Amino acid sequence: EKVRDALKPPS
Amino acid sequence: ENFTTNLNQLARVGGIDPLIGREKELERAIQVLCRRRKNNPLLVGESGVGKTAIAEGLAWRIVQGDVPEVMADCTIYSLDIGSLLAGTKYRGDFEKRFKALLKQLEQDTNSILFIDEIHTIIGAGAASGGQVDAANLIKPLLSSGKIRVIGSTTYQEFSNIFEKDRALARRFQKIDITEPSIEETVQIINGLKPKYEAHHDVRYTAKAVRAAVELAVKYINDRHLPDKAIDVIDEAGARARLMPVSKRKKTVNVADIESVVARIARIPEKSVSQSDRDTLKNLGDRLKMLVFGQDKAIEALTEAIKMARAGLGHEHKPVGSFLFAGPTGVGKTEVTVQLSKALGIELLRFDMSEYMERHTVSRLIGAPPGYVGFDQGGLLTDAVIKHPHAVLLLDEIEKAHPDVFNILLQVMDNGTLTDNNGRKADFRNVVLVMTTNAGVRETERKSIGLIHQDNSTDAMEEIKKIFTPEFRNRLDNIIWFDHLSTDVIHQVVDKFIVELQVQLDQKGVSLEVSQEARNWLAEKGYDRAMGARPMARVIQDNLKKPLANELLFGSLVDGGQVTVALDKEKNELTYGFQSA
Amino acid sequence: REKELERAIQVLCRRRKNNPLLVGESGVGKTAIAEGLAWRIVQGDVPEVMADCTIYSLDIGSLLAGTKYRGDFEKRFKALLKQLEQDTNSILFIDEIHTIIGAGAASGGQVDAANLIKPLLSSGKIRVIGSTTYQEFSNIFEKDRALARRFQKIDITEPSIEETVQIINGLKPKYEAHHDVRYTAKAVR
Ligand SMILES: Nc1ncnc2c1ncn2[C@@H]1O[C@H](COP(=O)(O)OP(=O)(O)OP(O)(O)=S)[C@@H](O)[C@H]1O
Ligand SMILES: Nc1ncnc2c1ncn2[C@@H]1O[C@H](COP(=O)(O)OP(=O)(O)OP(O)(O)=S)[C@@H](O)[C@H]1O
Ligand SMILES: Nc1ncnc2c1ncn2[C@@H]1O[C@H](COP(=O)(O)OP(=O)(O)OP(O)(O)=S)[C@@H](O)[C@H]1O
Ligand SMILES: [Mg+2]
Ligand SMILES: [Mg+2]
Ligand SMILES: [Mg+2]
């Protein structure tokens, strides 16, 4: 469906 | 670090609410914590029952020291997921935080992490890719049993989400919680009464609290008993402090709580005001000034209303359920419509000719499962909730599918119709009036004889063929509307003449009709079999039509001063128009 | 709207669960009571308990303007609640409260604005005024029995014919100034 994903940047 | 809060420390300052009663429920938790396996308890329940207070109250009990020695040394912790997720922007932030907190629990071996809404952590902490959810992370530790935690969830949430994770469910031991008895609730209020008395600077009487729990459950049906009662006690104090006077009514006496429950439930309160008393007393003739004849029908409507407001009424049924049958053109519906106007309450109309199919009737109680529209819920349940005190008109109920009867049967017997969504609608204050034309053909039918006979008895048999005895047995009354008499018609003519004058007043036109002309209009339009609608046609043909031509193109553009009179020589009315 | 305001203030003055929820059909004036409370306060015709109170309206769009990174929305939302908890003399008017049910969520994350606000509402540290239609409240807000229990529903009913003419007369100067016109008493009726 239409799902929002929150990315994580590398430290 | 800062995500966890030491409930015990909060208890020292008094922030935690002291737990009252719930002695048996507490025992089950302590027993579950002590056992070797299944160390983690799960407090399943309903919203507002007090499952969270038990966990928060457990720490309060520990500091007080009214617990076994084994649990006295324990320190209950509470995790806030929002703080945990506040700064988890980089990779591994959530894992390091949650894992770090878990290390603290295992080293101590005596702490308990009371996490409310345990179902939330099932899919929290992993945005995408890693899929490292808190549930998966904690799972291994629970297998060994080194760490014990307390959870809270509802029945719907537990089955829909928590039950899916069989691993977590195996570790936790379900606990069933139920709302406490009314007897237990009053003790809870008394125990908590000092806290609310100081904040509001008021003193609650022991008699008032008992009334609150009893009155709330009777009228407030959307919440459970423990929180529901407290809502009436908190608002009561708020109302007293807000009085313009300097806390003259410091103590909260009886009959004051009745206002709060009535206001919350949106139902008429006791100790009716003089305005309402005058309105109910005056509503013996005011209806008779718009609907002439059919006095027995009006009396039934006013008695049901007078009884309910007096305090004498059915415990779970509505104020009144009536079936208005009879000939065409009688005030079966008008008396209902004018009732809502006289009472100043919203009129709920439901033309049953649109609910003649089974699929359509399903829209009243709720919404079909197939529809994905966000506007779920039934048309009758939503309307009742919006206007609990109202008049419900089911016109031409005989046309509706028999399935509708199954809905009304539980309404007149129980007074509540739960919708598909689960909302509870109270029909205690809603008047129920349904009209029909069953057997109407017999009323207009003429017999094969010199003398026309009264087919009212035969018409009733048809009503008994459509409406089962159980349906009629639950109805408070089954009123039959008598035919309009000649004397009554003269009153009906005046009613239509007044309406005509009102329409003319908007155009600055005045109309005066002689009594002789009014009588002549009655003799032409009077038809016992066809009620009073033919009279309207006569008013249109002899009064509206001659003036419509004059109004558009004629002397009666403004001013009016019309005069209508009968011409006995030709038995025809003479119209006089003045241009003013 | 003296009766409706009297109940809203009563709910706000409550020790616990002091969060009103103005419900009613579109056009009744639910947002007129929340915003009007501020106008009533500055005018000075309010009880001393309500004086010095500040009403803040929440813009959910601005809140989620740049919450791309994980946890950004939670930090921003929690930061706002801390300000309310610290002052103890402020309210947060959340219009279209059905929207906050699911605002910021992961691929399968149950966490949302409703979960974060839920603990503080029960404690009573922060006061929150809500405004939503009957349809949304029953099909969206009433689904979460936990969030609804904390909110005290207030039914805003359509006013009578006489009540509305007074409202127009009250708002007549504002409209007259914008159009540089004058409205007669017969027109309003
Ligand atoms: N035994 C009790 N002692 C004191 N207060 C109680 C007790 N039981 C219920 N209450 C009150 O009722 C409120 C509601 O019960 P809670 O357990 O706090 O609800 P909850 O589990 O947070 O509700 P949700 O979020 O709708 S599942 C408590 O916060 C107290 O104010
Ligand atoms: N008893 C009455 N007194 C005054 N006006 C009446 C009376 N009965 C009918 N009328 C007039 O007739 C109309 C109202 O008819 P209704 O009462 O709605 O008919 P009904 O009982 O629904 O009949 P059906 O359609 O056969 S179920 C309005 O124009 C009323 O002014
Ligand atoms: N009680 C009132 N006193 C003065 N003006 C009012 C009042 N109620 C409504 N109005 C005016 O009517 C306008 C339209 O009502 P709204 O404020 O849009 O109602 P609402 O209930 O907030 O609408 P929804 O439900 O959000 S579509 C208001 O913005 C005011 O200009
Ligand atoms: Mg809770
Ligand atoms: Mg009718
Ligand atoms: Mg609005």
C-alpha count within 13 angstroms, C-beta hemisphere, residue B384: 28
Ligand that lies nearest to the alpha carbon of residue B17, given by its number in the listed order: 1
Q: CB-based contact (8 Å) between A9 and chain C?
A: yes
Locate the chain B residue with the closest alpha carbon to C152. B264
Region of B117 please: left (phi>0), alpha (psi -120 to 50) or beta: left
Locate the chain A residue with the closest alpha carbon to C66. A6
Rounded Cα distance, B522 and B497, in Å:
12
Q: CB-based contact (8 Å) between C82 and chain B?
A: no
B125-154 residues touching A, CB cutoff 8 A: 127-128
Is residue B252 a contact partner of residue B202, using CB atoms and an 8 Å limit?
Answer: yes
Are the Cβ atoms of A9 and B92 closer than 8 angstroms?
A: no
Rounded Cα distance, B70 and B39, in Å:
14
Rounded Cα distance, B432 and B209, in Å:
33
Other CB atoms within 10 Å distance of the CB of residue C115:
22
Are the Cβ atoms of B127 and A6 closer than 8 angstroms?
A: yes
DSSP-based helix, strand, coil % in chain A, nearest 5: 0, 10, 90
Residue type, B475: L
C67-126 residues touching A, CB cutoff 8 A: 67-72, 105-107
Task: Give Cβ neighbours of residue B124 (< 8 Å, ≥ 6 apart).
Answer: B81, B85, B133, B134, C106, C109, C110, C111
Other CB atoms within 10 Å distance of the CB of residue B447:
10
Resolution (Å) of this entry: 3.3
Are the Cβ atoms of A6 and B128 closer than 8 angstroms?
A: yes
CB-nearest to A4 from C71, C72, C105 is: C105
DSSP bridge pairs for B392:
B348, B432
**Which of the listed residues B287, B295, B334, B336 should we mutate to test ligand 2's pocket, taking the one with most ligand atoms within 8 A of CB?**
B334
Cα of B329 vs centre of ligand 2, distance in Å, is: 4
The phi, psi pair for B135, rounded to 5°, reads -60, -45
Query: From which experimental method does this structure derive?
Result: cryo-EM
Are the Cβ atoms of B90 and A11 closer than 8 angstroms?
A: yes
Locate the chain A residue with the closest alpha carbon to C71. A6
Size of interface B-C (CB pairs under 8 A): 121
Residues C53-63: b if buried by 16+ CB within 10 A, e if exposed:
bebeebebeeb
Region of C124 please: left (phi>0), alpha (psi -120 to 50) or beta: left
CA nearest to C127, candidates C3, C4, C20: C20
B-chain residues within 8 Å CB-CB of C189?
A: none
Question: Is the alpha carbon torsion for B195, B200, B201, B206 positive or negative?
Answer: negative
